[PDB]
Amino acid sequence: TFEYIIKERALLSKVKWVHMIIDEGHRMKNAQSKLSLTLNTHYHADYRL
Amino acid sequence: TRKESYAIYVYKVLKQVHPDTGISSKAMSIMNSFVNDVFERIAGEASRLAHYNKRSTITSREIQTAVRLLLPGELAKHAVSEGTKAVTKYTSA
Amino acid sequence: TRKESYAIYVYKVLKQVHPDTGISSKAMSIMNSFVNDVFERIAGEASRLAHYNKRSTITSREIQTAVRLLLPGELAKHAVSEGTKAVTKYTSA
Amino acid sequence: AKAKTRSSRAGLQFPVGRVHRLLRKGNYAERVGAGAPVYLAAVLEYLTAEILELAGNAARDNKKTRIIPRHLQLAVRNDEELNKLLGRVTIAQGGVLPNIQSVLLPK
Amino acid sequence: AKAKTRSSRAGLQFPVGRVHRLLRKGNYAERVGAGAPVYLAAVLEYLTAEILELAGNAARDNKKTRIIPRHLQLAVRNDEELNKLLGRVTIAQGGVLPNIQSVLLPK
Amino acid sequence: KPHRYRPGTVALREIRRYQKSTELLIRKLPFQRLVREIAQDFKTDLRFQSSAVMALQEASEAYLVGLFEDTNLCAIHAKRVTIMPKDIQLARRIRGER
Amino acid sequence: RYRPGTVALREIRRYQKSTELLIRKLPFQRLVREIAQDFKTDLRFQSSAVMALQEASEAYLVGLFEDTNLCAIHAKRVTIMPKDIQLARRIRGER
Amino acid sequence: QIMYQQMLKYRGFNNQIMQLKKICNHPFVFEEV
Amino acid sequence: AKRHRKVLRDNIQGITKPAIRRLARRGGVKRISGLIYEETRGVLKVFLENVIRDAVTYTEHAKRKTVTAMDVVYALKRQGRTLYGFG
Amino acid sequence: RHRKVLRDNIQGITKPAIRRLARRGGVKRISGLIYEETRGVLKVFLENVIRDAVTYTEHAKRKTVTAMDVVYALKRQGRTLYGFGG
DNA sequence: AAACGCGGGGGACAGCGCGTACGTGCGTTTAAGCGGTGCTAGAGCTGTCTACGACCAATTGAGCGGCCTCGGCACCGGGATTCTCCA
DNA sequence: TGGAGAATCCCGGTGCCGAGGCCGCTCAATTGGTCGTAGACAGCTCTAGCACCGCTTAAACGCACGTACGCGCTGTCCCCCGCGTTTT
């Protein structure tokens, strides 16, 4: 979920991801918010959607 | 040497206010010690405010703020009146 | 918009004094406040002396008098000497 | 030209033109709006009225028709906002007000 | 001519003509005797050294190379003459020196 | 071996660590709401510097801490470790507040 | 004769019924020459600077004795002790 | 509807959008009302 | 309750009794009386108000609506609580 | 050729003067621990003014003492007193 | 006055009692605060602008220093009053 | 609850120096013209304070309770002052 990749950035972002699926991009709307830049701490997503 | 003495004007206020009672020159010296002391307290405060507004002007609004911040209760508010009112008398005369 | 502050000057005296210790900008701001703070303290004391004796040329003699008065103990006598020291470097230069 | 003071113009006794001369000669600001001297000397007249009342009051309470500094002590310090306002301002030969400590006095 | 700052003439970091400019600005006197700004910038750099000394002292005493206001509290308030002179100056994010009352300590 | 203490014991490390640390001891939304409430009570509708909020808080909690020392000075002076409000008001008295 | 203790309070009346100082004056002027001559000598001693400080001294001391008994009666004593005075001056910020 | 004109005649902050959305649903969202 | 909320306390009392306990431990209290948590709060707000009224007085003489930490400097210095790190 | 220098008239300020002023300050049983506990503390008051006030004198280029610089120092210490001009 | 004593009895002080309080622990939430929005407000930046007392010339009576009292209040004599300490 | 006495307050006679006004004589305080300039005040912009809720969750709060200390009560001894002293 949204805030549980925020608080859990130290574990599930250390393991690698290839295909990520993020749902409901209307909360993804602001780049000033906390959520978007943490997916670069998620560090990899070769396929995205 | 005309040294601006404050016996006569404070004594004019005494003959206005408690005219039955005179004033000892020890007490009159307390008043004469009071005068420019108080005249410079709020004046230094007000020039500080004049640089808080960063102004080379000072109006009666600045003395009004010197009354507004500092004086306890109606001693402010009457001087909010009085300080303006004789200003209102001086803007009338 | 180059606006004269004391951040690189407190940095100058820092790396003159504690180059082994960098600064937080909070401590830098505390000192930048403090600079103008005592810069106003001693110089308002000096203008107070310049009205005590009704003088219009405040020299380093008068800042010496203010350093004599305000500062407790060595803080006087050091700023007596140090406040003279670069004075003797500038009266030379 | 015509020497005529501002105290009658504002209804005061204190020389508001001396206030304006001291105001320009006080360097509080460059432009010295002459209403600021009047806002000064007005509060001067008003508080001199405030204090001479109390001073002659304490005098006549001490059966005196001359204000002595003891009457200034009884004038100022009995007022709560004057003593709150003049917590560190003193009247010479005002003396002390009669007050014994409570458990010091017998009960 | 150019800004060739007057602190280099005095061996200082604080430009003594900015100080002379400030003394001409601060309404302290009509003539600002040109050693009064050097007295000022000299006492200034003396105290800058005074406090940057104890500041780096307390900062590296806390094993940090960054001087913080907590270090400023623990260096300044430990001093007799400084905290005696600055009994009413508060340091934000300075906090307290670590110390307990003696009888509140358990036995 | 359990460690239930008697009324009195646990406090002192906090008395260490608070004074070992350098922070405030207050819920800030009840504090910033206090700032907006009190400042509204003089004149409503301010835009509100939170810098002003902490600039008040630092002088606040320091003065708060400062009063409790003289409170316990009056308390232990009156031979007490349980502080009383009369210690506080006498402390404010000799401090000149009361 | 009498007991220890009784005739204090009318003094606390009378002194505070009155306006004066309660101190020897040739020791006062000699103490002024004493203390002002210690910093710089050769002062020609106006009595204005002599008497100008006694109100600043004695009244504040009188105020201190009230705080003294405030700490003494808060600690429940009237035989006042300097523990009360220095705890007061602590909370006064003198001590 | 008096609250539409009277509370707008008051004209704290951010209330002018908030108060009219409220009173058309309930007056009881306001505690004093 | 669930029909209407009504769950507010205060802002002076929004400071919690464990927060008063926290400050009392930083201030040197061993056993706090229960009356301390409110006699503390009263004098806390007493201290609070006098600054900000004159800070708003600054704000009006400086013709503003944003009461600043600059005004906290302007006041606390003059109200004897001079603070470093805010000006 | 006579050097007039005085020292410690604070005992010429008597202990009966303390039995006066302690009553003026509201003390009943002035213990023996008090009377000289007073006489030091006020002396802390005593030099600190004149330490600054003599400091006024020499920049003023003088060899006398006025109460003007007493007022300068007292107001400089926040010990404002009237009866003396101002 | 100071100054030196000096009964003298109760005030400090010790100290013991007692009982409760106030933390303490821990169960119970809970509002704290964080993000996270959405926006907009007055702050902020400029944009000219003129008026404003500056400043200085003239003047002039203000007001206060030096010059005239005489009287509010202190000083004292005598007595009435009124608080206190031993019956 | 009461008188003896010591302190206080009050009231009558004296007189005086200080409070207050008198008499010039300015000098400062004013009026009279600037004087650009200071802040007067128009526009602009943009930001920065703005609430707000999603939500957590640990802080606050809910309460059992345990005893500590703060006072309940005492005797004392002490201790400091009061009465008497004189000198300084």
Author numbering:
A (entry chain A): 872 to 920
B (entry chain R), C (entry chain V): 29 to 121
D (entry chain Q), E (entry chain U): 12 to 118
F (entry chain O): 37 to 134
G (entry chain S): 40 to 134
H (entry chain A): 1020 to 1030, 1047 to 1068
I (entry chain P): 15 to 101
J (entry chain T): 17 to 102
Copy the relevant paper text.
SWI/SNF is the prototype chromatin remodeling complex and regulates the expression of 5% genes in yeast. Within SWI/SNF, Snf2 functions as the ATP-dependent motor that drives the fundamental DNA translocation reaction underlying chromatin remodeling, whereas many of the auxiliary subunits target the enzyme to specific loci of the genome. To understand the mechanism of nucleosome recognition, we report the cryo-EM structure of the yeast SWI/SNF complex in complex with the mononucleosome. Based on the specific biological activities involved, the SWI/SNF complex is delineated into three functional modules: the motor module, the actin-related protein (ARP) module, and SRM.
To facilitate protein expression, truncated forms of Swi1 (residues 251–1336) and Snf2 (residues 430–1400) were used. The recombinant SWI/SNF complex bound to the nucleosome in a manner similar to that of the endogenous complex, supporting the complex was reconstituted into the active form. The current higher-resolution map allowed us to identify several functionally important elements, such as the FH of Snf5 and a YEATS-like domain of Snf12 (more discussion below). We found that the tripartite organization principle of motor-regulation-recruitment also applies to RSC and BAF, which provides a unified theme to understand the functional modularity of these complexes. Because the DBL is positioned close to the exit DNA, the structure suggests that different transcription factors interact with the DBL to recruit the SWI/SNF complex, and the motor will then slide the nucleosome away from the transcription factor-binding sites (on the exit side), potentially opening up the promoter regions, consistent with the role of the SWI/SNF complex in gene activation.
